[PDB]
C-alpha cells in the first residue's frame, strides 16, 4: 500500500510530494543508528504544520518514534499560526508551504513565530526574492511574505506572515531556452540589535567585490530597532542578481555570528553569488527543486527548462529519483545545439494535476 | 541532503582567489479567440517536436500509448462472477481514474429533482448517482443555506429548483456533472420516468457541518407586565443555568430573553419580553443541532450478476414502510386546519 522510503533525507520534500500526489507514504529508518533515535523536534512540528494545513490526513508515529505513516488529505489551508521550535528557523517551514500554497481550498495566511534566519536554511529575503518570482512566473500572481518582526539566533522572536491568495489550478508550462542576461544586481543588508554601521560595512565589502563590472549594483539596508528587532543581536546580507526581461533572479545570503566581520560577510556573500552565477542557468541550485516540482505538477504538456552541467548534483538526482518514486515521471535531458556552454534542457511532461479542492 | 536548502559552495579562500576576477561571466552580464487558439496550437506543436525524440522513451515511458493504440491489459483480482457471467451484449467500459477519484469523502453538489420525474426526493433516501465512471447507490442529505449563513438540512429536495446535497462517495473534480436515478431494476421500472436527480459537483471535502433547527418550546404560566414565568422547555435549574441569557420569542413575534432559573419548580424560569405576552402563546428557542452524513456506499456492480438487470440495492423509506406495513408518522397537531378568526374587540 504505502510508498516506503529509507532514511530521513529529503523529509520535507517527501511529505510535500505525498501531499501533492495523494499517495500514502511511509518513511522507515529515521536515523536508526543514533543514541537518541527517531524524529527530531523540528520534523515533528513540521508534521503538525502539515496537519494544520491539510485536512482528512492521518499521521502515525511509531512507539519507538523512528518511522512515520503519512496518509495525505485535501489541502484546505486557511488563516493560522505556527510556533516553530528554536532548533530550526522559519525558513525551514515557509519553504515547503510555497509548494502546497496555491493549491488549497482557502487562501494561505500563515504567520510563523520563531528564529528568522540561520546559516544552513532559507532567509526571509532569500525566500522572497528567490522563491517568489519563480512562483510568479510559474503561474501565481498575488503571493506575499510580510515580515512583521525578525529574530536572530538563538533567542529569536521573529514573526513572518506568509499570505498567498492567488489559487491557480495548475502551474503553467515553463519554456526557458535562453540564458537570462542579468539586468542588474540588488541586495538587502539587515541587522538586529547591533550598531547601524555594520550594515554599511557589509554593503561596502559587497560593493568592493562587485565593483569591477559595469552593471548596476544596488543594496538597500534595514536596521531593525525596537520591538521589531527580536530577542538577540545578529546581522546578515543577501545579494540577488536580477534579470528583468524574463523576471528571473539568483540569490546568495549569509548571516554573521559571534566573532565575524561584516566586510568578510559582504565579500563572502558576493563571491558565493558569483559562484552561483557561474553554476547558474536560469535557475539557481537553491530555486531548482520547487521549480521542477511545479514543472511536473503542471498540465499534461511538455515544459522545457535550460539547466547547466554544474547544477546536477547528488542532491538533484536524489530529487529526481524520489519524484519518480512518488508519481512516476521521467525528465528528458536533451542537449542544446551550442557548445560554448553545457546546457541541457530538462523537458518534463507534466502530470495531469489540478487544484481539485477549490469550490466552483 | 535537501534539508540543507542553501546550495554547496567551496571554501572562502579558494572562492576569493577564483572570484578576484569577474570576466568569465561578463558575457552573461550586459482577435482574442484566435490569439488563444494560436497559443494553444504553438504549445501542441512544441509538444510534438519534443516528443520527436528517442522512440521507446516516448512510446512507453515519457507519455505512453497515445490514442487508438490497440492495447491488451492484464488486470488481477478480477472476481469469479465477471468471467462466469460474461455476456457480450453488455459493454466492458474502462476508464482510468485521476488521483482525486481514488479518494473518498463528502461531495457537496447542487442538484435538482428532474423536471420529468414525478415524485420529490427525500433526504436519506438512497439514489444511484452516475458520477464520472462510477455509478453507486448512496444516501444524500439535501441542504439549504438560509440566506448564506448556515448550511441547514431541508427534509426534501425543493419542487422546481436547485438545492444542495452532500453524499459520501468518491471524490470527483469540482464542476463535473452527474445524474442520479432512483431505480435500476426492470421489475420495478414501472411506467414513469426513471432518472430523478441531476446536478453538478460544487465542492469536495472530508467533513461537512450541517445543522437542523430544533426549537425548545415552553409555555407561560405566570404573566405580569413585561415578564413571565415559563413552564416547561427545560427539566431542571442546571439546564436553565446552561441556557441563561438566550433570546426567546413567542409565536406572536414578541421577543424576549431568559433571565433567571426559578428556584421552586425545577424546570421553570423567568423571562422578560418586549411587552405583555398572553397565556395562549408558545415561547420558542431556536437552536442548532448538528447532523452527520451517512457513509453508506455500495456501487452497482451489475456486470457481476446472473441477469444484469434486476439490481436491487437499498430501498426507499416508502417501500420499506409498505413492505412491513408501517403507517407513516403523522403528528396530529402538525396538520393544518381552516383557522377562522373572531372579530377582535377591546374594552
Amino acid at each position: 500500500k504505502y510508498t516506503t522510503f529509507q532514511g530521513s533525507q529529503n523529509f520535507r520534500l517527501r511529505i510535500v510530494l505525498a501531499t501533492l500526489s495523494g499517495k500514502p507514504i511511509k518513511i522507515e529508518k529515521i536515523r536508526s543508528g543514533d543514541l537518541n533515535p527517531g524524529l527530531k523536534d523540528y520534523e515533528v512540528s513540521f508534521l503538525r504544520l502539515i496537519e494544520s494545513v491539510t485536512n482528512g490526513s492521518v499521521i502515525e508515529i511509531s512507539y519507538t518514534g523512528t518511522t512515520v505513516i503519512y496518509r495525505p488529505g485535501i489541502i484546505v489551508g486557511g488563516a493560522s499560526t505556527h510556533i516553530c521550535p528554536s532548533s530550526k528557523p522559519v525558513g525551514y517551514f515557509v519553504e515547503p508551504m510555497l509548494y502546497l500554497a496555491p493549491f488549497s481550498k482557502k487562501k494561505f495566511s500563515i504567520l510563523f513565530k520563531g528564529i528568522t534566519a540561520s546559516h544552513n536554511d532559507a532567509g526571509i529575503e532569500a525566500i522572497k526574492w528567490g522563491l517568489m518570482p519563480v512562483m510568479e512566473k510559474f503561474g501565481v500572481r498575488e503571493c506575499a511574505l510580510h515580515t512583521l518582526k525578525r529574530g536572530s539566533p538563538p533567542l529569536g522572536g521573529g514573526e513572518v506572515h506568509l499570505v498567498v491568495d492567488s489559487l491557480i489550478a495548475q502551474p503553467i508550462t515553463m519554456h526557458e531556452i535562453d540564458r537570462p542576461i542579468i539586468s542588474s544586481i540588488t541586495g538587502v543588508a539587515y541587522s538586529t540589535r547591533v550598531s547601524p554601521s555594520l550594515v554599511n560595512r557589509m554593503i561596502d565589502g559587497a560593493k568592493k567585490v562587485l565593483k569591477n563590472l559595469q552593471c548596476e549594483v544596488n543594496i538597500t539596508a534595514d536596521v531593525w530597532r525596537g520591538e521589531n528587532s527580536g530577542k538577540s543581536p545578529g546581522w546578515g546580507i543577501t545579494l540577488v542578481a536580477q534579470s528583468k526581461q524574463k523576471g528571473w533572479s539568483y540569490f546568495a545570503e549569509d548571516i554573521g555570528d559571534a566573532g565575524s566581520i561584516p566586510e568578510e560577510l559582504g565579500e563572502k556573500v558576493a563571491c558565493q553569488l558569483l559562484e552561483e552565477i557561474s553554476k547558474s542557468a536560469a535557475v539557481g541550485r537553491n530555486q531548482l527543486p520547487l521549480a521542477i516540482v511545479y514543472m511536473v505538477i503542471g498540465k499534461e504538456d511538455i515544459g522545457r527548462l535550460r539547466i547547466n552541467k554544474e547544477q546536477i548534483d547528488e542532491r538533484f538526482i536524489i530529487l529526481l529519483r524520489d519524484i519518480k518514486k512518488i508519481f512516476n515521471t521521467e525528465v528528458f535531458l536533451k542537449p542544446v545545439d551550442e557548445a560554448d556552454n553545457e546546457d541541457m534542457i530538462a523537458t518534463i511532461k507534466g502530470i495531469g494535476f489540478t487544484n481539485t479542492s477549490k469550490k466552483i | 541532503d535537501l534539508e540543507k536548502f542553501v546550495p554547496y559552495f567551496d571554501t572562502f579562500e579558494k572562492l576569493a582567489k577564483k572570484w578576484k576576477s569577474v570576466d568569465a561571466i561578463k558575457e552573461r552580464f550586459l482577435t482574442w479567440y484566435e490569439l488563444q487558439k494560436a497559443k494553444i496550437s504553438k504549445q501542441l506543436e512544441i509538444n510534438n517536436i519534443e516528443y520527436q525524440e528517442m522512440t521507446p522513451e516516448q512510446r512507453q515511458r515519457i507519455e505512453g500509448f497515445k490514442a487508438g493504440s490497440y492495447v491488451r491489459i492484464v488486470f488481477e483480482k478480477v472476481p469469479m462472477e465477471f468471467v462466469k457471467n460474461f455476456n457480450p451484449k453488455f459493454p466492458i467500459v474502462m476508464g482510468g481514474l485521476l488521483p482525486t477519484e481514488i479518494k473518498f469523502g463528502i461531495v457537496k453538489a447542487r442538484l435538482r429533482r428532474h423536471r420529468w420525474h414525478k415524485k420529490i426526493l427525500k433526504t436519506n433516501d438512497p439514489l444511484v448517482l452516475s458520477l464520472g465512471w462510477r455509478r453507486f447507490q448512496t444516501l444524500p442529505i439535501y441542504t439549504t443555506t438560509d440566506s448564506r449563513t448556515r448550511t441547514r438540512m431541508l427534509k426534501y429536495t425543493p419542487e422546481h429548483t436547485y438545492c444542495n446535497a452532500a453524499f459520501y462517495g468518491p471524490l470527483c473534480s469540482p464542476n463535473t456533472p452527474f445524474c442520479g436515478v432512483q431505480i435500476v431494476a426492470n421489475s420495478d421500472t414501472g411506467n414513469g420516468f426513471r432518472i430523478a436527480a441531476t446536478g453538478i459537483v460544487e465542492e469536495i471535502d472530508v467533513n461537512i457541518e450541517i445543522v437542523k433547527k430544533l426549537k425548545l418550546v415552553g409555555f407561560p404560566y405566570k404573566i405580569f407586565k413585561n415578564t413571565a414565568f415559563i413552564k416547561d422547555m427545560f427539566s431542571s435549574a442546571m439546564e436553565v443555568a446552561r441556557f441563561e441569557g438566550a433570546q426567546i420569542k413567542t409565536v406572536s413575534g414578541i421577543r424576549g430573553e431568559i433571565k433567571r432559573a426559578l428556584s421552586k419548580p425545577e424546570g421553570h424560569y423567568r423571562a422578560a419580553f418586549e411587552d405583555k405576552i398572553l397565556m395562549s402563546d408558545i415561547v420558542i428557542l431556536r437552536s442548532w443541532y448538528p447532523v452527520r452524513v451517512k457513509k453508506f456506499y455500495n456501487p452497482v456492480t451489475s456486470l457481476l450478476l446472473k441477469e444484469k438487470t434486476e439490481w436491487k440495492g437499498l430501498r426507499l423509506t416508502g417501500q420499506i414502510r409498505a413492505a412491513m406495513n408501517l403507517e407513516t408518522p403523522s403528528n396530529p397537531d402538525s396538520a393544518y386546519h381552516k383557522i377562522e378568526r373572531v372579530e377582535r374587540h377591546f374594552n
Binding site: 527517531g38 491539510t54 485536512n55 482528512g56 492521518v58 499521521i59 502515525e60 518514534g65 | 467533513n207 457541518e209
Partner: peptide, 14 residues
C-alpha cells in the same frame, strides 16, 4: 475552536 472542523490527527505512540 481548533477541534470544530478537523478530521485527521497526528497519532504519536511514542
Amino acid at each position: 475552536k481548533m477541534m470544530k472542523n478537523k478530521r485527521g490527527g497526528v497519532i504519536d505512540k511514542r
